[PDB]
């Protein structure tokens, strides 16, 4: 799941960035309303479907559909904010969704269930896991300070300058993603234990803590100082944006 | 001294949150109250300097989000409105920390509570001191988060969880 | 028997209806001295019908009394803070028994 | 409670009463002061005060950026 969400999903957006936008700029222009409509529908409908999912992995997996379609809106905005934000959100999603799948995997390896109803009250038996899970939950809501907020807001900036309606439909994700992320976190970690389902617990071992450390460092690092990444990308992004025009 | 105003509650919250197991209730109550009270004292000095002295302060740490014309930065603005809000926030927060020392004295989890109070104070300071819309937005979301964390502080209560989710 | 149980179940309904009506009389009155009169008047409603023997009529009166309670019920009833629905309910509960914490999980060996 | 005594947390869990909490509190206070020294130095270096204050102020002791932005035409 980590490889599928963090890398393989990025191949379609990489193909859009690498071949479709620069090779056929006129078609890219002609199809832009089509892409905007598809992505906006995906963000709203898939976020609302996410809200009604009862499986941990199913909630994290549906979340990725909304995030990648925001990425597509950004890249088809065809400006610096749009493409820069699309790339930054691709990388940030690759970190954040991978960490979330790792959290769910930590839970599944011990308890062998993905159904949310069995869990609850885990803050009192697994506080370290609870804290790390909360951090990555915040990152998945695009909380300012986290890496995903940079890409999300830069994409909204890029979209607003082209079409204010598409930016408005895409900013609804701020409300829906919060809703499902916080609902998931509070149903898993908050509340009381249910000893008739689970009564034996273990917090993270050293290997799991170490695994989480670089994800935390990368998320915070991109969130507070995205300049290291954006400085290495601007020339390429600029030439992609300009390709096909000579004024 | 102007950076100390903003970052002292963050330091206190960090020590109460990451090392509360070494301080316990009493240590964490002291550590957090001291750091916010010192920020309050420095805030009074800043009110004397900026509003009464008519000498605004501008401090730019580093760029935050630089993409072509988009120029969000880690920058702080201290004018009369800013120091007025600074006095209000830091003084009320110091008093509330002191009050909580005795109000939550029988609560099992007071160090986490004090850490949350201090992190809220830091995010509110980031809100009122920002020199641009994006730092203000960071403070906006941070105080939203701290409010959510404090509303459902008693995490076993279903009413509190519903209220916190509704507020967010 | 059966007539005894059927009459007994009715009695329970009346005793519980009266208890809830009395507790609500206190929600609408607040002050003790107003409660005294209001409670006296509610008790007089039940006493007027206390002596009915017909069982279908008892059932109709019980249903009417429940409907009346449910309509004139105080929107925001008082609850003891630690009771279910109270302001202190499920704050700092005692931990459940039967919880085991495992050490040395997930070792490479 | 009973099982929570076997549960490790950074904040210490319920009713945390470390035996050496006074010495630990003192060590934390010394650490926060040491961390605050470089922050204060950087703040003094970074502060910009375009206007001379009406009366002398404490920041004039350590900050040397008073009345430096007058030629804003040359800003870059």
């Amino acid at each position: 799941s980590v490889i599928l969400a963090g890398i393989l999903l990025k191949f379609g957006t990489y193909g859009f960035l690498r071949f479709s936008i620069p090779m056929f700029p006129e078609a890219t222009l002609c199809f832009t309303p089509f892409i905007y409509t598809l992505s906006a529908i995906a963000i709203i409908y898939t976020s609302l479907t996410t809200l009604r999912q009862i499986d941990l992995k199913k909630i994290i997996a549906y979340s990725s559909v909304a995030h990648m379609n925001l990425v597509t809106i950004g890249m088809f905005s065809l400006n610096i904010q749009g493409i820069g934000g699309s790339i930054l959100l691709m990388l940030s999603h690759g970190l954040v969704s991978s960490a979330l799948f790792l959290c769910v995997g930590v839970l599944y390896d011990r308890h062998k269930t993905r159904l949310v109803r069995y869990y609850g009250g885990l803050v009192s038996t697994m506080p370290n896991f609870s804290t790390i899970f909360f951090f990555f939950t915040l990152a998945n809501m695009s909380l300012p300070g986290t890496s995903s907020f940079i890409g999300e807001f830069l994409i909204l900036v890029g979209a607003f300058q082209r079409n204010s309606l598409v930016a408005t439909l895409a900013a609804l994700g701020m409300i829906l993603g919060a809703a499902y992320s916080l609902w998931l976190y509070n149903r898993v970690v908050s509340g009381n234990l249910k000893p008739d389902f689970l009564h034996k617990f273990s917090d993270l071992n050293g290997r799991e803590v170490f695994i989480f450390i670089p994800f935390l460092v990368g998320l915070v690092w991109m969130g507070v100082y995205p300049k290291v990444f954006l400085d290495c990308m601007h020339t390429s992004v600029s030439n992609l944006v300009q390709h096909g025009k000579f004024h | 001294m102007y950076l100390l105003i903003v970052f002292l509650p963050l330091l206190g919250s960090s020590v109460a949150g990451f090392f509360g197991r070494f301080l316990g209730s009493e240590g964490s109550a002291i550590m957090t109250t001291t750091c916010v009270s010192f920020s309050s004292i420095l805030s009074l000095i800043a009110f004397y300097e900026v509003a009464l002295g008519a000498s605004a302060c501008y401090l730019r740490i580093a760029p935050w989000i630089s993409s072509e014309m988009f120029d969000a930065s880690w920058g702080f603005l201290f004018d009369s409105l800013t120091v007025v809000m600074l006095i209000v926030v830091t003084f009320i927060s110091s008093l509330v920390h002191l009050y909580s020392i005795s109000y939550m004295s029988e609560d099992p989890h007071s160090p986490r509570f004090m850490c949350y109070l201090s992190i809220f104070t830091f995010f509110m300071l980031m809100l009122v001191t920002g020199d641009n819309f994006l730092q203000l937005f960071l403070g906006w979301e941070g105080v939203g988060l701290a409010s959510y964390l404090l509303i459902h502080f008693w995490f076993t209560r279903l009413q509190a969880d519903k209220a916190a989710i509704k507020a967010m | 028997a059966a007539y005894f149980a059927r009459r007994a179940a009715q009695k329970e309904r009346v005793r519980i209806l009266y208890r809830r009506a009395l507790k609500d009389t206190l929600n609408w009155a607040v002050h003790r001295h107003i409660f005294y009169r209001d409670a006296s008047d509610l008790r007089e409603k039940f006493n007027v019908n206390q002596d009915v023997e017909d069982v279908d009529r008892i059932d109709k009166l019980i249903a009417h009394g429940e409907a009346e309670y449910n309509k004139w019920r105080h929107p925001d009833p008082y609850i003891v803070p630690w009771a279910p629905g109270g302001s202190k309910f499920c704050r700092n509960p005692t931990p459940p028994a039967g919880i085991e914490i495992v050490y040395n999980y997930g070792l490479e060996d | 409670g009973d099982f929570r005594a076997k549960v490790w947390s950074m904040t210490g869990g319920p009713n945390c009463r470390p035996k050496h909490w006074r010495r630990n509190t003192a060590i934390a206070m010394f650490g926060v002061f040491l961390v605050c020294i470089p922050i204060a130095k950087l703040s003094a270096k970074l502060e910009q005060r375009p206007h001379m204050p009406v009366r002398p102020i404490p920041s004039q002791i350590w900050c040397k950026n008073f009345g430096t932005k007058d030629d804003y035409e040359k800003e870059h």
Binding site: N128, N205 | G24 | V102 | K19
Partner: peptide, 28 residues
């Protein structure tokens, strides 16, 4: 009395990362 009488936790509750300590004098 909470400020003048030292705490009772000679050692903290739990074990960091849920690993039992090594035997006295030994290393993990």
């Amino acid at each position: 009395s909470r400020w003048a009488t030292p705490g009772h936790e000679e050692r903290p509750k739990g074990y960091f990362m849920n690993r039992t300590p090594p035997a006295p004098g030994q290393s993990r």
